Design an enzyme around this catalytic site. Structure first.
Site, PDB file in Angstrom:
ATOM      1  N   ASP A  57     -32.343  53.693  13.185  1.00 11.03           N
ATOM      2  CA  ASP A  57     -33.039  54.559  12.252  1.00 11.03           C
ATOM      3  C   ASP A  57     -33.778  53.718  11.196  1.00 11.03           C
ATOM      4  OD1 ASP A  57     -33.838  56.724  10.537  1.00 11.03           O
ATOM      5  OD2 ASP A  57     -31.863  56.581   9.453  1.00 11.03           O
ATOM      6  N   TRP A  86     -27.426  66.410   6.241  1.00 12.23           N
ATOM      7  CA  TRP A  86     -27.903  67.295   7.279  1.00 12.23           C
ATOM      8  C   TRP A  86     -27.052  68.517   7.527  1.00 12.23           C
ATOM      9  CZ3 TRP A  86     -27.131  62.311   7.409  1.00 12.23           C
ATOM     10  CH2 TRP A  86     -25.959  61.841   8.027  1.00 12.23           C
ATOM     11  N   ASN A  97     -36.174  58.274  13.673  1.00 16.61           N
ATOM     12  CA  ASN A  97     -34.736  57.998  13.522  1.00 16.61           C
ATOM     13  C   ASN A  97     -33.985  57.706  14.844  1.00 16.61           C
ATOM     14  OD1 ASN A  97     -32.192  60.035  11.693  1.00 16.61           O
ATOM     15  ND2 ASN A  97     -31.852  58.160  12.932  1.00 16.61           N
ATOM     16  N   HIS A 115     -24.126  59.685   1.746  1.00 18.55           N
ATOM     17  CA  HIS A 115     -25.533  59.568   2.048  1.00 18.55           C
ATOM     18  C   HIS A 115     -26.393  59.680   0.790  1.00 18.55           C
ATOM     19  CE1 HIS A 115     -29.131  60.667   4.381  1.00 18.55           C
ATOM     20  NE2 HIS A 115     -28.649  59.654   5.077  1.00 18.55           N
ATOM     21  N   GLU A 142     -24.141  53.409  16.929  1.00 16.51           N
ATOM     22  CA  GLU A 142     -24.467  54.628  17.589  1.00 16.51           C
ATOM     23  C   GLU A 142     -25.044  54.475  18.992  1.00 16.51           C
ATOM     24  OE1 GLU A 142     -25.795  56.850  14.247  1.00 16.51           O
ATOM     25  OE2 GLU A 142     -27.696  55.687  14.052  1.00 16.51           O
ATOM     26  N   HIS A 165     -28.988  55.065  20.226  1.00 16.84           N
ATOM     27  CA  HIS A 165     -28.839  56.401  19.700  1.00 16.84           C
ATOM     28  C   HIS A 165     -29.570  57.498  20.475  1.00 16.84           C
ATOM     29  CE1 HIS A 165     -28.121  58.444  15.684  1.00 16.84           C
ATOM     30  NE2 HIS A 165     -27.826  59.254  16.703  1.00 16.84           N
ATOM     31  N   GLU A 195     -20.138  54.277   7.094  1.00 17.65           N
ATOM     32  CA  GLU A 195     -21.175  54.891   6.305  1.00 17.65           C
ATOM     33  C   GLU A 195     -20.577  56.098   5.696  1.00 17.65           C
ATOM     34  OE1 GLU A 195     -24.641  55.805   8.639  1.00 17.65           O
ATOM     35  OE2 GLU A 195     -24.197  53.998   9.920  1.00 17.65           O
ATOM     36  N   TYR A 196     -20.820  56.246   4.417  1.00 21.28           N
ATOM     37  CA  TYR A 196     -20.355  57.440   3.758  1.00 21.28           C
ATOM     38  C   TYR A 196     -21.263  57.645   2.581  1.00 21.28           C
ATOM     39  CZ  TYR A 196     -18.209  54.914  -0.163  1.00 21.28           C
ATOM     40  OH  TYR A 196     -17.972  54.180  -1.306  1.00 21.28           O
ATOM     41  N   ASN A 242     -32.934  56.723   1.694  1.00 20.55           N
ATOM     42  CA  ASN A 242     -31.539  57.034   1.402  1.00 20.55           C
ATOM     43  C   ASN A 242     -30.903  55.963   0.563  1.00 20.55           C
ATOM     44  OD1 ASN A 242     -32.132  58.702   3.790  1.00 20.55           O
ATOM     45  ND2 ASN A 242     -31.533  56.832   4.919  1.00 20.55           N
ATOM     46  N   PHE A 301     -36.489  61.057   5.778  1.00 16.62           N
ATOM     47  CA  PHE A 301     -35.261  60.490   6.317  1.00 16.62           C
ATOM     48  C   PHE A 301     -35.076  58.982   6.203  1.00 16.62           C
ATOM     49  CE2 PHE A 301     -32.363  63.794   6.686  1.00 16.62           C
ATOM     50  CZ  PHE A 301     -33.116  64.953   6.888  1.00 16.62           C
ATOM     51  N   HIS A 313     -28.572  47.159  11.336  1.00 18.60           N
ATOM     52  CA  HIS A 313     -27.630  47.225  12.443  1.00 18.60           C
ATOM     53  C   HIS A 313     -28.031  46.148  13.422  1.00 18.60           C
ATOM     54  CE1 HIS A 313     -26.128  51.012  11.046  1.00 18.60           C
ATOM     55  NE2 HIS A 313     -27.292  51.623  11.175  1.00 18.60           N
ATOM     56  N   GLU A 315     -28.439  49.423  19.571  1.00 19.96           N
ATOM     57  CA  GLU A 315     -28.373  50.833  19.218  1.00 19.96           C
ATOM     58  C   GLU A 315     -29.157  51.647  20.178  1.00 19.96           C
ATOM     59  OE1 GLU A 315     -28.986  54.497  15.914  1.00 19.96           O
ATOM     60  OE2 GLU A 315     -28.851  52.324  15.421  1.00 19.96           O
ATOM     61  N   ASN A 375     -42.218  61.735  13.942  1.00 17.13           N
ATOM     62  CA  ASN A 375     -41.564  61.061  12.826  1.00 17.13           C
ATOM     63  C   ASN A 375     -40.561  61.891  12.065  1.00 17.13           C
ATOM     64  OD1 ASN A 375     -43.979  62.181  11.132  1.00 17.13           O
ATOM     65  ND2 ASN A 375     -42.272  61.650   9.736  1.00 17.13           N
ATOM     66  N   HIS A 435     -30.462  47.302   5.026  1.00 14.15           N
ATOM     67  CA  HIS A 435     -31.457  46.940   6.029  1.00 14.15           C
ATOM     68  C   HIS A 435     -32.356  45.853   5.505  1.00 14.15           C
ATOM     69  CE1 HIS A 435     -31.249  50.491   8.839  1.00 14.15           C
ATOM     70  NE2 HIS A 435     -31.733  49.559   9.653  1.00 14.15           N
TER      71      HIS A 435
HETATM   72 MG   LIG Z   1     -29.435  56.502  13.999  1.00 13.31          MG
END
Ligand SMILES: [Mg+2]
Ligand SMILES: [Mg+2]
Ligand SMILES: [Mg+2]
Ligand SMILES: [Mg+2]
Lengths: 1021, 1021
Positions: free
Chosen positions: B199, B997, B100, B538, B459, B416, B535-536, B602, B599, B389, B414, B595, B355
């Site tokens: 991610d 999370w 991620n 999940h 991110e 992140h 993003e909302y 989603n 995750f 992204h 990104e 890994n 994605h």
């Molecule tokens: Mg990320």
């Protein structure tokens, strides 16, 4: 092998804006790596920092490709021993090119010419074994123009672009103990050149220093300083952010201490690790300290209060790993409510643009030169300087920090020669390259207090790249404003309206990018920013006319916070003649093509730092004290914002036509922005005729760091009274005799004789005794040897029909022929009266008409009375007066009028009325490009030898005819003529100067009346 | 030679952010070089554009350095024949890594690992001699991950970074007629990787297309379109700016024509040469036309009105040099007064993040897949998509343009995994690299109407680099807003507050970067921007609880204009078993290290594009019609902004406990933002007991391009009445017999017998006839096989003590032991009454207490009545009910309650009350990571085999025990158990989903009352 020229050169990195560097370290503020805190504190020298300046071996090649692989391994037989830093054009290898706009090379980005002058420098040197045990040894070049590749001990190190900022490489692993060798190959042209099209000589080489710096392994990588204040500045916070490189070990600490002298003012200690910044945490390799300072002494150009900041990187047991430092100045810069403020008050920028130029060294700078410049500026009433148009030599900021000058730091980006201007700056592909020119500047100069404004470059139009870069800065360093003039002067990329050559009152509305009158520009709808001119008052040759108009607006409109005059020094270079005699050279004098000739000479001072007369006009207009006279009370106003008149005395004085009747001295006690009242003693007043003048001067009794004792900082003069002369002369004992003939009229009286030629109508000769006085007849003059401003950009090839000279030329002014209309002699009761009339015509057009009367009396005085008629439809004449060539040659000149210096009508406020006496030599102004010069206005009496002329006129006098001036390209080629040439003007047109490429003479200064009248009295002693 | 691997690889360009490309052409909108205007107009295919997709030869190496110079010259024996485009991990070479945040490689910018998987692709192909006479032949790679070098006919061509945008090279001079060969070397890791830490699975290769484009020598280099409107959109101006390359010849012209179908709407012709832009002039190689369009048809996601624009480059004699084209959509996007407007009205974004993922192809996209996705989205009530992204495959925009979806285009940036997040984005040295990721995106996608917002990446914290880039965009394309969430969601780099996972009502105030409740965020002092969540909700596994809360705020607060759900598809991949059987794999299933396991799953749909049940909840909440019932009048509200309900029918219907009593159909005539009133016929009303329910559905009678006929676009249901049952059952003919023993109590009545074990207190068995019904006793259940949300980021290594599961675990819920407190049988007049009580305890703590009564009557019906007591101080239980294992296994399940689909308490608004009948198989939800699933709430009656249970409960039923679910990592490993497992809940806690999370179950959905009561009736048929 992969170190081979062959391999390296292959990629042609200098023809690719996508490669601006290879293996170059990051930018940062100046480091020394002191290993003792005191040295750091006192700015002693760091043994960890070594100069490689000196004798280097050099060899020139016409193309990178002509370099021999051998070079990498061994010196070259024919390599010369050159001194570094230097500009190789300064040594003879190739020519320097003086071009303005038009790029030196052919426009084909990102390509460069195949013939591309390569300079191979090399240096053999020793590295001390200690440096190789630990730490890092890196190399620095403060300026390499334009691009270069680097090898060390035959290995390839890296590449770099950007002529005006440092490139650093880590040599750590190429170095061997003892003897090492560097091979540096410098390319004249690169893709970087497209971004370096400034109006200046185009040179090359390793022109700034070369150094070696040894740093610890765990070191300080960067640091910044910042100062916040409270509402009244009674308290500040110094904030230092430090970052380090290496291994982070918990025993590591940082101490930041602030000294003021010997006195430590504040100290702070902490270990690495910043505050949480985002979801992942903080910087473990950074720390920020904040020191509180109560009642800090503030920095300003008026009083450069400085502190010393020491940054120590140590372990907790007190052991020092290393130290860095910088000078700190507490000041706040803000634009607020349309005004630019410094420490809460609004500045009035008295500034100038300055290039890094040395007539001998080309573009290599030295401390002496910097300092000279600074002091001249400060002495002459300047506050600030603009780094036209690139980052300067590092020391510069430091001096400014210390002596006190506001500095505008400017990115090395100028693409003036593209079409349109925008072409690259609007192109995303140049974004990176540009980006580095801005970012590195900031990372390097950000801690200097003298820098108060950042500039994005010059004359590169307006592109999306600017907008981004401007935002970047604002984000990174909000302590300063950003400015950029390109694209109209008021774009979204500038915090200040900063035009160049905008007139005071007149608009110049070019399409797309007009230049409104400054007073008007401010009130355009929606506009609210302050306005400060990035360039104004083009000081090319005989210039600066109208300077005062500017000063006055600045003073009346708040949002007009001054500007930068263009420019400081003449960019002339030294050449040598047939006998090792030097002379000032300019554009195209090096067989340079294509070129802009004199266009490189617009300074206020000559390349040797000797002033042009304009300099005074500036000095006076920019003075910090202002006067008003009310009755016998003088009101003094201080323009200082921070300091009190504490090294100031006022000298006053009264005089009648040059004769002193009274003097005083009074100490000034005026606070910044304050007034002081001064009442004068009862002033004498005589019966005698003449003008009574009051003159005051402010003096600096004590010496400062930039001024000597007794320096005069300001002055002003007023006329108080006039007692007109109601006295008729004593009835002549004698009477002049007129002897007629068909050729002429002769007048005799005493030893004296005057002859007027009846065919020409001019006074052809005159004798005192047996001696003739003229070499040339006294005749009417309506022209002048064209100043730079009269010419503009007009060339023989490409004529500018609007240039004054062209108009004059075209209309026949220069070649009009006189015509006797009348010439008579008459006998008066007690005098002889001659009467003439000529017409000047060209192609059957009568341009002017001159009507005189000469009247010689028993006193042996001739009174000339002149009356000109100018045709409405002819360009107004440059002047109106007479001239003649005198036979004599005297050592001095004495006059009662404005002076002592050269003064023109739209440029005479700095001059004073009085009796001046100077050497003939001083009545000529050696402008490198000869033209009309040396005038002095408001003259009432002039004395040369046995002659004395009286009236109201302007005049000039030298050993050069107008024609000679007009026909000589350089001053070094002028030769003194037989006697003395005298030009006496009833009237003279202004010199202009708003710019030097279009008519800049304001209407008030143009001889547009039609009817002109004047009178003289010539006589002897 | 200098083409040698040895030489090339030497520079290590992939370990240097200062080299992002070498010899790559500029970016631009999609070109085809049609040579006939009609083809261009109709989007026919250009013979000048050739695909090199197909069979290529490939060979994998563990490091670039292990490649053999031979490769450059000739294929390799062992090179395989692979298909391109593809992801080599998809073929077996190395593993795909599912990580991620944490970067795949070791964090040492800009370095990469020495072991760096290199893929050598090669292709032999033919170039037609015609292409070499003239024009330019260039090559294009639409996506190479992560970096690569290129050779052609053994010569080195160039290098490129940025996995998600095209790299183009001019092959013009490397090509030979006939047979040519390409050698492409693709590096997995590069300095570009530091900027690609999204991610998602980490893969590599030539994963998008490869083409050849032949252009004329004098061609169109770029063009942009723009549309301005008037106050009411009744008139527009289409503005096209065209630039060309080559020699500019006066006979050159440009024509821009606008078609609408077959109908030309407007045309304009002109020759090169723009308006004056600055002091140097204009662009001679550009031209801008402006076409006026009266009453243009506007583009929107509701109605994708499109025009065709043709750009012809011709000579004046009418001869066509070449043509380009694009689809045009007339729309205006603006933020005004805090609101985001589209064509003047304010949007409400019903969107999702998507994605580019294919379970089989990895990250290679195809038209079919794109289209599927689009249609599912449109069918399910989505308006918009975010390119999480990075820039997507080109065709994507085109489809969106055409089908109608709003697109947020996002830069491929990104970082992140840095610490802090900012680290690179705040570094000037990354400015260039970043810069190219933004600029090229814009140059390429700017002409698509579907793109309405630009995003700077994801991110990567908040750095000065963002600020610059944001300003750049604004300058270049002011037609769209820019957004970026990094650094707090409301920085200076975003036009919209765009947080991720902000809750509706609760704040999450992390230091530095808190996440306020969305309603609150808007009114923070000084704030005025619109808020749209990037993003909302999940959607990981059994999720989407609370979805409705969001929808409701969106609807009540104007400035809350929706958001993007996270995310579309599960990023699971296909693996094969011991028998060539496929199964869905996830993080770490490829021996991938390190890994993030599940995750990567989603999505709202499974990788195969089959929906998760959550999808409905979305569909319903996002529906475009809204209802209100008032008496017998239905008020319909349209949420369409532009279109009229013109393919909509409303079906209505009334039913009593599943039994239909009435139906209607009514055509909707509601305008966008309008209301429609609907009065229902007099509604029947029966004496019979039960609930009367009104249900309405909106139907699309006709098919559209993304929907079939009879598609249901919305629905809503209401309860109208209730006739309570005041009827007592018929006094039992018989009476049950109780047979005691010390082991148990038996109840017999008829063929039926029930046994309760006196030692345990549970009903151990029951018979119908000779057949036993249970395999397991009926017992109390307080736990559940943890959903993804219950677990969060808790791992065996690193336990998250806050995760629900952990709490439950720690408290003994999962391993509590029952305790008979009491168990008695009593004989009633007409029934038997059993009474029990247990205590569940763990470590001497009584967690719960269960008290029941079973009452069997002459009817042979047992009534269970249950009463739980939950300790105040124990984590609230996931559920409260009973379970048991039935012996039978039936084909169907029939119930009267909510359905038909899986529904949980905080996720049941999309479900309808009714009688459902489905196959057992459908009562299980195959979430790849097994957990509690399949629940159906509000059940009143359930029927399975001969059993029938009645009451008010939630239930679930499958062939897998909770324990089996809980203990299986993948669904493919589950095995059906002996009979049927039945879980009947009096109560169930919500599923949460605000994020996965941290605890996301809202308080209203937590079983926190302490006292719980419920009753059942079990019986047979
Ligand atoms: Mg990320
Ligand atoms: Mg370069
Ligand atoms: Mg210039
Ligand atoms: Mg790179």
């Amino acid at each position: 092998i992969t170190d081979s020229l062959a391999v390296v050169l292959q990629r042609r990195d200098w023809e690719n804006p996508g490669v601006t560097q290879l293996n170059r370290l990051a930018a940062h503020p100046p480091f020394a790596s002191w290993r003792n805190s005191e040295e750091a504190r006192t700015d002693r020298p760091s043994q960890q920092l070594r100069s490689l300046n000196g004798e280097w071996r050099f060899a020139w090649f016409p193309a990178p490709e002509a370099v021999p692989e051998s070079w990498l391994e061994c010196d070259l037989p024919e390599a010369d021993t050159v001194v570094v830093p230097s500009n190789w054009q300064m040594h003879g290898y190739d020519a320097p090119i003086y071009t303005n706009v038009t790029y030196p090379i052919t426009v084909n980005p990102p390509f460069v010419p195949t013939e591309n002058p390569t300079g191979c420098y090399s240096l053999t040197f020793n590295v001390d074994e200690s440096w190789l045990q630990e730490g890092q040894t890196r190399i620095i070049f403060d300026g390499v123009n334009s691009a270069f590749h680097l090898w060390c001990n035959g290995r390839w190190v890296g590449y770099g672009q950007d002529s005006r900022l440092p490139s650093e490489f880590d040599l750590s692993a190429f170095l061997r103990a003892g003897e090492n060798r560097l091979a540096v190959m410098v390319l004249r042209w690169s893709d970087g050149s497209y971004l370096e099209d400034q109006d200046m000589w185009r040179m090359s080489g390793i022109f700034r220093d070369v150094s070696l710096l040894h740093k610890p392994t765990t070191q300080i990588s960067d640091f910044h300083v910042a100062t916040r204040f409270n509402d009244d500045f009674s308290r500040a916070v110094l904030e230092a952010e430090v970052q380090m490189c290496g291994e982070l070990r918990d025993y590591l600490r940082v101490t930041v201490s602030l000294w003021q002298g010997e006195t430590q003012v504040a100290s702070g200690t902490a270990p690495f690790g910043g505050e949480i910044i985002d979801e992942r945490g903080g910087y473990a390799d950074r720390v920020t300290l904040r020191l509180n300072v109560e009642n800090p002494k503030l920095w300003s150009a008026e009083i450069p209060n400085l502190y010393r900041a020491v940054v120590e990187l140590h372990t907790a047991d007190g052991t020092l790993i290393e130290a860095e430092a910088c000078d700190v100045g507490f000041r706040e810069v803000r634009i607020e409510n349309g005004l630019l403020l410094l420490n809460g008050k609004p500045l009035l920028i008295r500034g100038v643009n300055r290039h890094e130029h040395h007539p001998l060294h080309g573009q290599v700078m030295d401390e002496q030169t910097m300092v000279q410049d600074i002091l001249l500026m400060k002495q002459n009433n300047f506050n600030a300087v603009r780094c036209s148009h690139y980052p300067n030599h590092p020391l510069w900021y430091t001096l400014c920090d210390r002596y006190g000058l506001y500095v505008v730091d400017e990115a090395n980006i100028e693409t003036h020669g593209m079409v349109p201007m925008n072409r690259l700056t609007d192109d995303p592909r140049w974004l990176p390259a540009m980006s580095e020119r801005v970012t590195r500047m900031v990372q390097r100069d950000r801690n200097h207090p003298s820098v108060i404004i950042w500039s994005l470059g010059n004359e590169s139009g307006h592109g999306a790249n600017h907008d981004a870069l401007y935002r970047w800065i604002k984000s990174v360093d909000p302590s300063r404003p950003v400015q950029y003039e390109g694209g109209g002067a008021d774009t979204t990329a500038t915090d200040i309206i900063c035009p160049m050559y905008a007139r005071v009152d007149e608009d110049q509305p070019f399409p797309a990018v007009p230049k409104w009158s400054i007073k008007k520009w401010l009130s355009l709808p929606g506009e609210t920013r302050p306005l400060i001119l990035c360039e104004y008052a083009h000081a090319m040759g005989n210039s600066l006319g109208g300077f005062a108009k500017y000063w006055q607006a600045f003073r009346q409109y708040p949002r007009l916070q001054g500007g930068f005059v263009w420019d400081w020094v003449d960019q002339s270079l030294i050449k040598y003649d047939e006998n090792g005699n030097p002379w000032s050279a300019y554009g195209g004098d090096f067989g340079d093509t294509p070129n802009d000739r004199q266009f490189c000479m617009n300074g206020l001072v000559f390349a040797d730092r000797t002033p042009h007369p304009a300099l005074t006009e500036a000095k006076h207009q920019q003075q910090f004290f202002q006067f008003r006279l009310s009755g016998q009370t003088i009101e003094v106003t201080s323009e200082y914002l921070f300091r009190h008149s504490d090294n100031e005395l006022l000298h006053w004085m009264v005089a009648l036509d040059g004769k002193p009747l009274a003097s005083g001295e009074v100490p000034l006690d005026v606070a910044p922005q304050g007034k002081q009242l001064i009442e004068l003693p009862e002033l004498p007043q005589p019966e005698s005729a003449g003008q009574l003048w009051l003159t005051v001067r402010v003096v600096q009794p004590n010496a400062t760091a930039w001024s000597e004792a007794g320096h005069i900082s300001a002055w002003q003069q007023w006329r108080l009274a006039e007692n007109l002369s109601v006295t008729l002369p004593a009835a002549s004992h004698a009477i002049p005799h007129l002897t007629t003939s068909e050729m002429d009229f002769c007048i005799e009286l005493g030893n004296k004789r005057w002859q007027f030629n009846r065919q020409s109508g001019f006074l052809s000769q005159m004798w005192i005794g047996d001696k003739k006085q003229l070499l040339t007849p006294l005749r009417d003059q309506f022209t002048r040897a064209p100043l730079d401003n009269d010419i503009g950009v007009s060339e023989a090839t490409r004529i500018d029909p609007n240039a004054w000279v062209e108009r004059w030329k075209a209309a026949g002014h220069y070649q009009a022929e006189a015509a006797l209309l009348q010439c008579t002699a008459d006998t008066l009761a007690d005098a002889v009266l001659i009467t003439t009339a000529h017409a000047w015509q060209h192609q059957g057009k009568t341009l002017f008409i001159s009507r005189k009367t000469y009247r010689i009396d028993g006193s042996g005085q001739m009174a000339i009375t002149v009356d000109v008629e100018v045709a409405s439809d002819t360009p107004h004449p440059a002047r109106i007066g007479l001239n003649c060539q005198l036979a004599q040659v005297a050592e001095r000149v004495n006059w009662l009028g404005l002076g002592p210096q050269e003064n023109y009508p739209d440029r005479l406020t700095a001059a004073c009325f009085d009796r001046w006496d100077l050497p003939l030599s001083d009545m000529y102004t050696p402008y490198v490009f000869p033209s009309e010069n040396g005038l002095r206005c408001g003259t009432r009496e002039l004395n040369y030898g046995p002659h004395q002329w009286r009236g109201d006129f302007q005049f000039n006098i030298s050993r050069y005819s107008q024609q000679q001036l007009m026909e000589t390209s350089h001053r070094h080629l002028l030769h003194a003529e037989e006697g003395t040439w005298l030009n006496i003007d009833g009237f003279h047109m202004g010199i202009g100067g708003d710019d030097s490429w279009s008519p800049s003479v304001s209407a008030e200064f143009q001889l547009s009346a039609g009817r002109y009248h004047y009178q003289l009295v010539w006589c002897q002693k």
